């Protein structure tokens, strides 16, 4: 059966360590803590992108990071829209993340361009 988990808040100061050393569940938690609770677009977008672009991370994590970029876009009024869009569009051609890119783009277009 599917399991609901509402993201835990990981303190800002611990995030980069978790992203360097952490196992997959730790990393997902960090991505989601960023997605749901951090307000600094630039600080957060930078970190999500490094996960999304990292070829040594499993597709599950890369895809989640994109979905998380979708969440930031939904939540944060002062995002750089053009940067968010170029990012999501630059992924449309590679399959590991394409599907989440499309849904993150849905999030961008609704909350920030409509």
């Amino acid at each position: 059966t599917m399991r609901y988990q509402e993201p835990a808040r990981i303190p800002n100061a611990e995030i980069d360590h978790v992203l360097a050393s952490g196992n997959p569940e730790a990393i997902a938690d960090a991505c989601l803590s960023i997605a749901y609770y951090e307000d600094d677009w630039e600080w957060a977008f930078k970190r999500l992108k490094s996960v999304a672009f990292d070829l040594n991370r499993p597709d599950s994590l890369r895809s989640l990071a994109v979905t998380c970029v979708g969440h930031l876009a939904r939540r944060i009024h002062d995002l750089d829209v053009a940067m968010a869009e170029e990012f999501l569009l630059s992924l449309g051609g590679d399959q590991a993340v394409a599907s989440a890119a499309s849904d993150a783009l849905d999030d961008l277009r609704i909350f920030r361009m409509s």
Partner: protein
């Protein structure tokens, strides 16, 4: 987040077979809820207003037998 996460997730529907993104409606509180995969069968979710759902989301809701209009 949503009030009734677990049961609202169980009675949810996948929007498109190309994406694990699902959607449901809380029978109790009446809110519309979007769910995304975390890892494996684990999911997280957020509340949305009717006009913030896409055509696909709304189609898959009404047609699922979840909302009148």
């Amino acid at each position: 987040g949503p009030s009734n996460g677990q049961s609202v997730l169980e009675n949810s529907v996948q929007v498109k077979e190309t994406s694990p993104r699902r959607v449901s409606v809380d029978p109790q509180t009446g809110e519309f809820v979007v769910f995304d995969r975390t890892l494996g069968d684990v999911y997280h979710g957020h509340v949305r207003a009717w006009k913030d759902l896409t055509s696909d989301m709304q189609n898959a809701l009404v047609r699922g037998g979840y909302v009148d209009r």
